[PDB]
Design a binder for this molecule. Structure first.
Ligand SMILES: CCCCCCCCCCCCCCCCCCCC(=O)O[C@H](COC(=O)CCCCCCCCCCCCCC)COP(=O)(O)OCCN
Ligand SMILES: CCCCCCCCCCCCCCCCCCCC(=O)O[C@H](COC(=O)CCCCCCCCCCCCCC)COP(=O)(O)OCCN
Ligand SMILES: CCCCCCCCCCCCCCCCCCCC(=O)O[C@H](COC(=O)CCCCCCCCCCCCCC)COP(=O)(O)OCCN
Ligand SMILES: CCCCCCCCCCCCCCCCCCCC(=O)O[C@H](COC(=O)CCCCCCCCCCCCCC)COP(=O)(O)OCCN
Ligand SMILES: CCCCCCCCCCCCCCCCCCCC(=O)O[C@H](COC(=O)CCCCCCCCCCCCCC)COP(=O)(O)OCCN
Ligand SMILES: CCCCCCCCCCCCCCCCCCCC(=O)O[C@H](COC(=O)CCCCCCCCCCCCCC)COP(=O)(O)OCCN
Ligand SMILES: CCCCCCCCCCCCCCCCCCCC(=O)O[C@H](COC(=O)CCCCCCCCCCCCCC)COP(=O)(O)OCCN
Ligand SMILES: CCCCCCCCCCCCCCCCCCCC(=O)O[C@H](COC(=O)CCCCCCCCCCCCCC)COP(=O)(O)OCCN
Ligand SMILES: CCCCCCCCCCCCCCCCCCCC(=O)O[C@H](COC(=O)CCCCCCCCCCCCCC)COP(=O)(O)OCCN
Ligand SMILES: CCCCCCCCCCCCCCCCCCCC(=O)O[C@H](COC(=O)CCCCCCCCCCCCCC)COP(=O)(O)OCCN
Ligand SMILES: CCCCCCCCCCCCCCCCCCCC(=O)O[C@H](COC(=O)CCCCCCCCCCCCCC)COP(=O)(O)OCCN
Ligand SMILES: [K+]
Ligand SMILES: [K+]
Lengths: 242, 107, 489, 359
């Protein structure tokens, strides 16, 4: 809260930013309180549960004890782990910027002093207390507004859309008939070659290489044109073969 | 003379393309044959068709017809004959075991 | 001595010939083809060391000079592709020993195998356009027969389809050679490269370059010329399909690469923006097909199409970083697609079904196969300790350096989608409870797949070993003056 | 150099796990995993004296020297804070998983292989100075966590959660790679400590690198709207939930933001994007955490809320770089607050998951 309140002093719209973060802390307290208050409190159920004795073994409990002890140790003693570890992390993240280094040190050594963020935490505590006791009253409204916006719905339907669109694409363009694929290949050939010719200007048509035409090739060309025409318009297949 | 050969190989290409896009398989193999003839005549035409002696050094003429495209055409002819004979026996096998000629009906 | 360059061509050829004499003796077929394939691997490795030590290797076939006869040229890129072909051929051959039944290999199967590797090996090393044509038809004819062999109804139908398409594209390559011979007058790569660079400001050369794009994109499937490949590769048996997916579509990529790094250099803007848009369309079609299907063979087919699109986009930039990246991605993608088809074949052998939704629970019975497929999938995607990382990394770096932000983002999202497809196979097939299959002990055929996987992992680790070959390849691709001064002496 | 055999020691022990698992059938395999994080933790206590008196630890292992790629390691206060967190909570989670799982009913070698791969990958993420090495360790983190979420593969909801978490985190990681590449072109080099001492705002690739790195870092640490995968990753085992979604993986994007802050916080897009999306996901997860009816979803939305708090404080600490009025220098306090709560969060959040696992 100290970092967020001193960040709204550079832009006006950033005044929106801490109070939103403030209600986040409200929400935080709620589930955490609800966690403990619906895990260990209440009453015991001797009909659905399994064991008559629920004493856990100690070896399972070793590592949570060590983690909770480290929690309590950096709780009551915050100075030595800060000065050992946390300061060169800040000098690493903010490289090339520390022309002095004593202000960071005297802020690490700072722990107490009356801050305006203290009553902010007190208000967090009081509002979470008055919000948790009435939680079975605004329960249905919260359930329906939580149903009102999620993000697994969008992702699941996006994958259904993607697989169905790809499958319908390959059901459209891959029919299996060889005539259609020949049409695609021939059309692509024609389009690429005609666009490549039309993009240029095709200068220098020189007819000087051309040979003198003679009568025998003319008559034989008319003959094989006749054979070509009678092999494309033939009704029977023997006519096309011959 | 090369212009007339160009328009007649273009008519062979149009005929071959129209036969390849048909419904029966024997028409497709006929189109394969016509496309091969068009390609071989195109090799001969683009090699040049100016008048000279046949490519034989026994005849002592001044200028000869180009020897390279004839050798290239003969290579292409024997390769195309091998592939054409294989594809015709393949069509015979398909008529024998499947039992149809309709190319669109082949699914 | 100087005939070492022909040893990737001559060794399988002779072998194919001597496999004609004894069809019914399947044991000696296996022994002779295995020994010749191992000798092919050794000779190709010796050729790669030869082209690394001293310069680019040129051999006139006869003793005839450089413009006027057939010249065979092995640079570093062709030697790398020949060695990769040799490794893929050996793994497919041992899987063929375990996989192909008796009846299909009494009828000349290993001969057709050796003719296919003759065709691809000859296509990677040649110095003539029309000789390259002849090697394309050797390759395609052997692929026709390997597709049709066995004679069930499915491979009859799609052999008809595949044969029709390749006949049309063969005729189109004939007419392209005809047009270019009318313009230039020569037929070898180096001297017609010199003649194109002597009259490089003519529009007909641009038209013929677009025609070669159309032909070689019919060979290696580009959008919108890809339409034959799903059914045609859904037809054949598994080692034949591993040969097809590992080798056939990638020699068209090499032909596009050699064409636009050697022949057509002037007026680069139009041809390169055409290659860029066709590559983006190819990537989009591949990832749509990979997302769409719940069938393993179709998933690997559309991963082939997507990887071809990525390689063509790497070709479409004339920077040495992009050329280096597409060479790395080319080698690893050949090996990886052959590996994945062999995986799909083993899984089909176990499940007796190809539908992902039909079976579940294979980790509980086949742990080595499951974690091998997991590592293969993550190496396909491009995770950095694995094989296919440095290629797409250099492609993305060269696209950002030339200010193509959107295309690099398309590449990264395509990597995401191909990962999603193969991991869909892994998560629905291997994980889950056991319902779909019956316990069947696999044998033998798992080991060539594991050999390919170990070579892919060792490739991803040792980029520093495999890199100076690729550096010499890039140094000869972005500078064709060394190519045209090596041949034309 | 003795830290080369520290970064790559969990990988070697992850190789050696199934040997001890199927060759020693009496003793629980987790005990054999137990000393190594302890050892690493003790080793990471050895640098505090050198880091308090402003000295750093540099190491180099070249991988592709001609493409100019190395595994570098740079050790300063931030990397030590994260490494001490990782190793301490790792040893405690290993102990809790020894006493939590069973022997003859659970595949345990898979569990400790995946966990130790994740620990080595996270220690690689933190200690790295090279961008491609950082991305490599990032991706290994994503894959190992994907394996850990789906530990029970015979149940459907674990596979759904693993698939969703995989797709979201891979999406963020790939766009993170794109931003790393754009930044490495914008600067001359690849190492992070030389990108600080060079100007980068006079370059067209600065803003796309900013947006892509920032997108990936928001995607890893479960920000808005990418917090979606973390409540469905609660079908993991409870030590996996504790360790991964308390202390290690959900703070990787926090580390990347705080690590690249001396480069990108000279612009306003970085600092206001970070601050605003942190406040938005803080309030949104704090609202949603009270709806749930089981313990682990409550703790997941709790985790998302405190991560949003930490990254909003990182945004205000990015605002610290521009100017401070007449030596007031107040914005630096925000940095300390973030780091404090960072450390703070890890500790108690781990304990909370352990508690609910017990009950
Ligand atoms: C199988 C067919 C093989 C080719 C046959 C071609 C026949 C050519 C006839 C020929 O040479 O005609 C001459 C030239 O034509 C001309 O001068 C006519 C030019 C225009 C020809 C158009 C053809 C359509 C005129 O004829 P000629 O030499 O017989 O006449 C004088 C003797 N009486
Ligand atoms: C002029 C050519 C010069 C070169 C010489 C070449 C000579 C050989 C040519 C190829 C020969 C192939 C022989 C195949 C077998 C033919 C006989 C059996 C089949 C048959 O009779 O089919 C009928 C023939 O077509 C018909 O009845 C109509 C056929 C029409 C063919 C027209 C060809 C175009 C020529 C144009 C000029 C070219 C000039 C070239 C110099 C189809 O009829 P159906 O179904 O009723 O069968 C009756 C069923 N009981
Ligand atoms: C430049 C000028 C323009 C380009 C040239 C145009 C030439 C057109 C020539 C005539 C075309 C005929 C089309 C025939 C359509 C199909 C057709 O009716 O086919 C069959 C009859 O063939 C026929 O009747 C066709 C016979 C062959 C055509 C005529 C050839 C004359 C050649 C003269 C010059 C020779 C020069 C030699 C070098 C019958 O069909 P079906 O299936 O019902 O069969 C049942 C039989 N049982
Ligand atoms: C190279 C390796 C060649 C030697 C090993 C393979 C052949 C193994 C023995 C097979 C054999 O004896 O085949 C005979 C011909 O052999 C041959 O023809 C094999 C030698 C091939 C020499 C190639 C150059 C001439 C015909 O065998 P059969 O009479 O028992 O067959 C009746 C049932 N198919
Ligand atoms: C010092 C630097 C070193 C640099 C090294 C660089 C190269 C790294 C390459 C890694 C290759 C890994 C290959 C996959 C492992 C194959 C394991 C085969 C045997 C197997 O399945 O074992 C399972 C246990 O192992 C497992 O479960 C372990 C495998 C699962 C984790 C895979 C993680 C991959 C991460 C991404 C790549 C890095 C059995 O399990 P079960 O319960 O079914 O037992 C059934 C009873 N026989
Ligand atoms: C390259 C990939 C190599 C992968 C490692 C080796 C794979 C095989 C390992 C041994 C397994 C047992 C082999 C038994 C055997 O005799 O297999 C023969 C094949 O030879 C073989 O499988 C040996 C092939 C050796 C190739 C590598 C040579 C390098 C020098 C015949 O097979 P079969 O009769 O057992 O099976 C037919 C069932 N339908
Ligand atoms: C029942 C048995 C089951 C087994 C199942 C296994 C499944 C997979 C498990 C994981 C396999 C891990 C393999 C590790 C390989 C380590 C590296 C190989 C050694 C080597 O020489 O590597 C590089 C060259 O390799 C190369 O270049 C070779 C690869 C490239 C081949 C070309 C075709 C692709 C040189 O690297 P370096 O030492 O120079 O660099 C490093 C820093 N300088
Ligand atoms: C430049 C690279 C930079 C770093 C990049 C990332 C590097 C990642 C490196 C880490 C990779 C981790 C790989 C872990 C898997 C190793 C698999 C080893 C094989 C294995 O597990 O064998 C088991 C152990 O027994 C035996 O092996 C035989 C024991 C008796 C002798 C057989 O047992 P099992 O696994 O089948 O049984 C499980 C019952 N559930
Ligand atoms: C088990 C708890 C071990 C605590 C850490 C070791 C002892 C300790 O207090 O170390 C301090 C750092 O602690 C730390 O940095 C504690 C890190 C804990 C991480 C989570 C576990 C440095 O020593 P010092 O600064 O306290 O004393 C010397 C001058 N005062
Ligand atoms: C969705 C997945 C991608 C999300 C990240 C997109 C990053 C775009 C960063 C902005 C950017 O590159 O803008 C300009 C070009 O636009 C672009 O490059 C727009 C690329 C859009 C890609 C959409 C992919 C789907 C470069 O200009 P500049 O950034 O320097 O200008 C200062 C603008 N504030
Ligand atoms: C997605 C979440 C992030 C959305 C913003 C991303 C783009 C940032 C644009 C640059 C920017 O923040 O401009 C500032 C205004 O802030 C803005 O306009 C931020 C949004 C304010 C309205 C919403 C508040 C909740 C300039 O203004 P400045 O305040 O930095 O100038 C004080 C000078 N000393
Ligand atoms: K032809
Ligand atoms: K002909």
């Amino acid at each position: 809260f100290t970092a967020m309140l001193r960040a709204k002093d550079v832009a006006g719209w950033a005044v929106i930013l801490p109070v939103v973060a403030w209600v986040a802390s409200i929400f935080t307290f709620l589930y955490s309180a609800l966690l403990v208050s619906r895990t260990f409190f209440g009453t015991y159920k001797p009909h659905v549960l399994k064991k008559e004795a629920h004493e856990a073994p100690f070896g399972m409990l070793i590592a949570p004890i060590v983690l909770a002890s480290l929690v309590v140790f950096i709780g009551f003693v915050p100075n030595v782990l800060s000065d050992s570890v946390l300061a060169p992390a800040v000098y690493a993240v903010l490289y090339g910027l520390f022309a002095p280094n004593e202000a960071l040190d005297v802020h690490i050594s700072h722990w107490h002093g009356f801050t305006p963020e203290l009553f902010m935490t007190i208000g967090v505590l009081l509002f979470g207390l008055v919000l948790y006791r009435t939680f079975p009253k605004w329960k249905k409204i919260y359930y329906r507004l939580s149903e009102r916006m999620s993000l697994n719905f969008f992702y699941d339907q996006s994958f259904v859309w993607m697989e169905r669109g790809a499958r319908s694409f390959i059901s459209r363009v891959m029919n299996g008939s060889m005539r259609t694929y020949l049409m695609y290949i021939f059309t692509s050939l024609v389009a690429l070659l005609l666009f490549t010719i039309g993009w240029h200007e095709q200068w220098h048509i020189d007819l000087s290489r051309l040979a003198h035409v003679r009568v025998y090739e003319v008559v034989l060309a008319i003959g094989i044109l006749a054979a070509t025409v009678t092999t494309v318009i033939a009704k029977s297949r023997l006519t096309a073969i011959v | 003379m090369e212009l007339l050969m160009i328009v007649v190989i273009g008519c062979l290409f149009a005929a071959a393309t129209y036969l390849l896009l048909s419904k029966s398989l024997l028409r497709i193999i006929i189109g394969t044959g016509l496309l091969s003839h068009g390609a071989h005549l195109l090799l001969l035409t683009m090699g040049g068709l100016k008048a000279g002696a046949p490519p034989l050094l026994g005849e002592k003429a001044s200028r000869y017809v180009d020897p390279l495209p004839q050798a290239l055409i003969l290579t292409a002819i024997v390769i195309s004959f091998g592939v054409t004979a294989f594809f015709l026996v393949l069509a015979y096998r398909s008529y024998q075991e499947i039992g149809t000629d309709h190319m669109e009906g082949m699914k | 001595m100087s005939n070492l360059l022909l040893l990737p061509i001559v060794i399988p050829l002779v072998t194919a010939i001597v496999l004609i004499f004894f069809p019914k003796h399947v044991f000696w077929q296996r022994v002779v083809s295995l020994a010749a394939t191992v000798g092919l691997v050794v000779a190709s490795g010796a050729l790669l060391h030869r082209v690394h030590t001293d310069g680019i290797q040129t051999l006139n076939v006869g003793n005839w000079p450089a413009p006027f006869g057939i010249t065979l040229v092995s640079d570093s890129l062709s030697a790398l592709l020949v060695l990769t072909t040799s490794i893929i051929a050996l793994a497919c051959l041992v899987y063929s020993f375990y996989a192909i039944g008796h009846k299909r290999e009494t009828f000349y199967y290993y001969s057709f195998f050796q003719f296919l590797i003759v065709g691809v090996n000859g296509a990677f090393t040649t110095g003539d356009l029309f000789n390259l044509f002849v090697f394309f038809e050797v390759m395609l004819m052997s692929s026709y027969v390997l597709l049709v062999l066995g004679g069930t109804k499915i491979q009859l139908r799609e052999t008809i389809k595949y044969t029709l398409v390749n006949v049309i594209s063969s005729a189109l390559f004939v007419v392209a050679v005809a047009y270019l011979y009318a313009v230039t007058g020569t037929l070898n790569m180096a001297h017609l490269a010199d003649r194109i660079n002597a009259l490089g400001s003519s529009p007909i050369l641009t038209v013929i370059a677009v025609l070669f794009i159309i032909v070689f994109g019919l060979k290696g499937a580009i959008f919108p010329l890809y339409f034959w490949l799903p059914g045609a590769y859904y037809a054949p048996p598994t080692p034949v399909l591993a040969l097809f997916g590992g080798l056939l579509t990638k020699v068209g990529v090499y032909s596009i690469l050699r064409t636009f790094t050697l022949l057509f250099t002037h007026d680069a803007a139009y041809t390169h923006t055409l290659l860029a848009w066709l590559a983006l369309g190819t990537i989009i079609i591949g990832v749509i097909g990979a997302v769409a299907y719940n069938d393993m063979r179709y998933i690997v087919i559309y991963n082939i199409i997507a990887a071809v699109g990525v390689m063509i986009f790497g070709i479409s930039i004339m920077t040495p970083e992009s050329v280096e990246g597409t060479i790395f991605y080319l080698l690893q993608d050949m090996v990886m697609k052959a590996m994945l088809f062999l995986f799909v074949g083993i899984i089909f052998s176990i499940t007796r079904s190809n539908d992902i939704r039909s079976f579940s629970g294979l980790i509980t019975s086949y742990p080595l196969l499951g974690w091998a497929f997991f590592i293969a999938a993550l190496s396909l995607a491009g995770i950095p300790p694995l094989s296919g990382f440095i290629g797409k990394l250099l492609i993305v770096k060269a696209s950002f350096d030339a200010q193509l932000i959107f295309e690099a983002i398309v590449i990264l999202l395509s990597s995401l989608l191909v990962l999603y497809s193969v991991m869909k196979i892994f998560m629905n097939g291997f994980w889950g409870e056991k319902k779909g299959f019956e316990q069947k002990q696999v044998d033998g055929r798992l080991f060539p797949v594991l050999f390919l996987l170990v070579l892919s992992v060792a490739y991803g680790i040792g980029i520093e070993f495999v890199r100076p070959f690729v550096l010499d390849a890039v140094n000869v691709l972005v500078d064709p003056s060394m190519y045209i001064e090596a041949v034309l002496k | 150099p003795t830290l080369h055999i520290a970064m790559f020691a969990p990988f070697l022990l992850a190789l050696l796990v199934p040997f001890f698992y199927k060759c020693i059938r009496s003793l629980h395999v987790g005990w054999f995993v137990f000393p190594l994080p302890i050892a690493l933790f003790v080793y990471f206590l050895s640098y505090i004296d050198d880091v308090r008196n402003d000295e750093v630890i540099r190491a180099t292992m070249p991988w592709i020297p001609s493409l100019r790629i190395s595994f570098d390691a740079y050790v300063d206060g931030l990397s030590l804070l994260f490494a001490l967190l990782i190793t301490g909570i790792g040893s405690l989670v290993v102990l809790y998983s020894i006493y939590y799982l069973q022997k003859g009913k659970e595949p345990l070698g898979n569990f400790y292989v995946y966990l130790l791969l994740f620990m080595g990958a996270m220690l690689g993420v933190v200690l790295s100075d090279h961008l491609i090495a950082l991305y490599m360790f990032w991706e290994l983190t994503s894959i190992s966590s994907f394996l850990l979420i789906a530990y029970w593969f015979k149940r459907d909801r674990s596979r759904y959660g693993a698939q969703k978490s995989m797709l979201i985190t891979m999406f963020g990681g790939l766009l993170m790679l794109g931003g790393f590449v754009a930044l490495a072109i914008a600067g001359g080099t690849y190492n992070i400590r030389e990108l600080v001492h060079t100007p980068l705002t006079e370059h067209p690739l600065f803003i796309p690198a900013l947006v892509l790195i920032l997108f990936g870092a928001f995607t890893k640490s479960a920000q808005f709207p990418f917090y979606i995968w973390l409540p469905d990753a609660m079908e993991a085992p409870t030590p996996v939930s504790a360790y991964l979604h308390s202390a290690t993986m959900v703070k990787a994007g926090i580390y990347v933001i705080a690590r690249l802050t001396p480069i990108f916080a000279v612009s306003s897009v970085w600092v206001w994007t970070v601050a605003l999306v942190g406040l938005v996901t803080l309030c949104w997860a704090s609202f949603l955490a009270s709806k749930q009816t089981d313990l682990k979803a409550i703790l997941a939305y709790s985790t998302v809320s405190q991560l949003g708090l930490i990254t909003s404080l990182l945004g205000i600490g990015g605002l610290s770089f521009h100017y401070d009025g007449m030596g007031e220098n107040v914005f630096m306090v925000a940095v300390l607050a973030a780091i404090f709560h960072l450390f703070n969060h890890a500790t108690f959040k781990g304990s909370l998951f352990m508690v609910v696992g017990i009950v």
